């Protein structure tokens, strides 16, 4: 009757991975070939899915009464604080590369380094989301500093208040309906977070006399770091690195939006008679339990238990094999989002089966409802 860990020594690979574009660069300059900038894009899409399948499932689920034990070893949180700084290095160093060697690089390599640093910005946000749902002060300010390096400092207010109030609900801009491409979704999504956060802090402060443009606003507080960062880095390295700083940013935002897509895709909460909505449940969130993908993204593939208890560090999060189950880990499902028709070849049927085959529990894209119900025989 023991919880001997399994992955314990191997959580420091998370200090490693954020430096993959940099040693990609070094290697690509010493050996003298060209593809070696496109190295994160291969690690993430082709060696981690293979390796995923090569290892297997995880054999570690914490039981119930060990949570108050697993939330008292500080190693699991020092490994997130240390990750916050490395991220600025990767950005600054890479940009100084392109400008210190514009005159020996092609344009392939520029696009490539930009994409690599974009994926690593996904890991900044997955280190900001894990350090926001905390109840200390240190963790919160660190969340904002780390999020500032991609310009997504309002994720704070947005994710917590909104997403955690109305996940799986017609009026949450992140819950994706069933029958909608990630393209039209990204449209309806990216402005959603911004508009909503702005209104939200406005109406909070308004109860008071401390005018909208204040200091304590947490949506315009990390712009004080993203504005100087870019103005400096750019006007120092010269205007030459503008075609590479935009690519990195857009790919970061794409990373975040694809996740939200495949997390709560198609799932809906039932309506209480003549009242409000029903509180979140376990069977409204997709999750997986493969090993190395979890090791990279601190267990995030276990989303249901996350919504089950927001405040719980990434070492007590349980696993469940009878709630909804994805087919694979996160990289392949990413690779399937971008191409919608096959996405519909697969996760359509899964969603119909696990949710219950009927139109009072699934959330159908409110632009084509009549088709979506007429075909795929459903019930109303």
């Amino acid at each position: 009757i023991a919880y001997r860990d399994r992955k314990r020594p191997f959580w420091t690979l998370s200090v490693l991975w954020p430096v993959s574009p940099l040693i990609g660069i070094y290697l690509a300059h010493t050996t003298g070939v060209g593809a070696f900038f496109w190295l994160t894009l291969a690690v993430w899409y082709l060696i981690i899915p293979l390796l995923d399948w090569v290892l297997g499932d995880d054999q570690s689920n914490p039981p119930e009464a060990v949570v108050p034990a697993l939330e008292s070893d500080r190693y699991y949180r020092i490994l997130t604080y240390l990750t916050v700084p490395i991220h600025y290095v990767v950005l600054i160093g890479s940009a100084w590369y392109v400008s210190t060697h514009y005159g020996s690089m092609t344009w392939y390599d520029i696009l490539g380094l930009a994409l690599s640093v974009g994926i690593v910005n996904g890991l900044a946000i997955n280190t900001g989301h894990e350090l926001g749902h905390k109840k200390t002060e240190l963790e919160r300010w660190l969340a904002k500093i780390v999020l500032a390096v991609v310009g997504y400092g309002h994720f704070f207010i947005e994710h917590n208040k909104g997403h955690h109030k109305d996940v799986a609900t017609p009026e949450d801009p992140a819950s994706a309906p069933f029958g909608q491409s990630i393209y039209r979704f990204a449209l309806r999504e990216i402005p959603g977070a911004i508009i909503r956060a702005w209104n939200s802090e406005k109406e909070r402060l308004g109860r008071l006399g401390h005018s909208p443009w204040s200091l304590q606003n947490e949506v315009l507080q990390p712009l004080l770091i993203t504005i100087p960062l870019y103005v400096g880095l750019i006007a120092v390295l010269g205007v030459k690195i503008i075609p590479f700083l935009l690519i990195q940013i857009v790919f970061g935002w794409w990373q975040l939006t694809s996740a939200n897509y495949i997390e709560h895709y198609g799932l809906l909460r039932q309506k209480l008679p003549d009242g409000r909505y029903e509180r979140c449940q376990p069977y409204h969130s997709w999750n997986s339990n493969h090993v190395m993908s979890n090791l990279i993204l601190f267990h995030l593939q276990r989303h249901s238990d996350h919504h089950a208890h927001p405040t719980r560090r990434y070492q007590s999060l349980r696993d469940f094999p009878d709630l909804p189950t994805l087919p694979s880990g996160y990289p392949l499902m990413f690779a399937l989002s971008y191409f919608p028709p096959l996405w519909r070849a697969v996760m359509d049927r899964r969603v119909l089966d696990v949710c219950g085959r009927d139109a009072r529990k699934i959330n159908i894209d409110p632009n084509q409802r009549e088709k979506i119900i007429h075909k795929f025989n459903l019930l109303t």
Partner: nanobody
Framework: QVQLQESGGGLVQAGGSLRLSCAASGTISRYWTMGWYRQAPGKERELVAGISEGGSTNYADSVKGRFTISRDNAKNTVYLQMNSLKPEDTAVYYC????????????????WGQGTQVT
């Protein structure tokens, strides 16, 4: 083998004292900290007591001043003589123990058991 037997349950008056104890066995190691964890109804298990090889208390601030946890007996032995009973704290108690390896290793081995539902 490795398990954690205990004693010390019952019902007493609110304003009395009681003593918890659980004695494990079969230890091939010598670095750890043995502690109590209580489960208030509707409450996720919070920490109550646990003492390290050297001896350094970490209670939860709500029990500070009434509960004490000590050893000084044959190996794999720990005590908690509780006092000043309230009906607001009445729960089930696991007696929990841990382990340790060279800092480099630091493979934490956790072991659990429960019983002695207080009042």
């Amino acid at each position: 083998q490795v398990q954690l037997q205990e004693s010390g349950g019952g019902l007493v008056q609110a304003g009395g004292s009681l003593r918890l104890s659980c004695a494990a066995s079969g230890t091939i190691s010598r670095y750890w900290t043995m502690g109590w964890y209580r489960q208030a109804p509707g409450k996720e298990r919070e920490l109550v007591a646990g003492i390290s090889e050297g001896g350094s208390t970490n209670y939860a601030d709500s029990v500070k001043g009434r509960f004490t946890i000590s050893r000084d007996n044959a190996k794999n032995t720990v005590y908690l003589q509780m006092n000043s009973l309230k009906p607001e704290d009445t729960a089930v108690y696991y007696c929990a123990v841990t382990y340790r390896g060279p800092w480099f290793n630091r493979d934490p081995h956790y072991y659990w058991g429960q019983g002695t539902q207080v009042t």
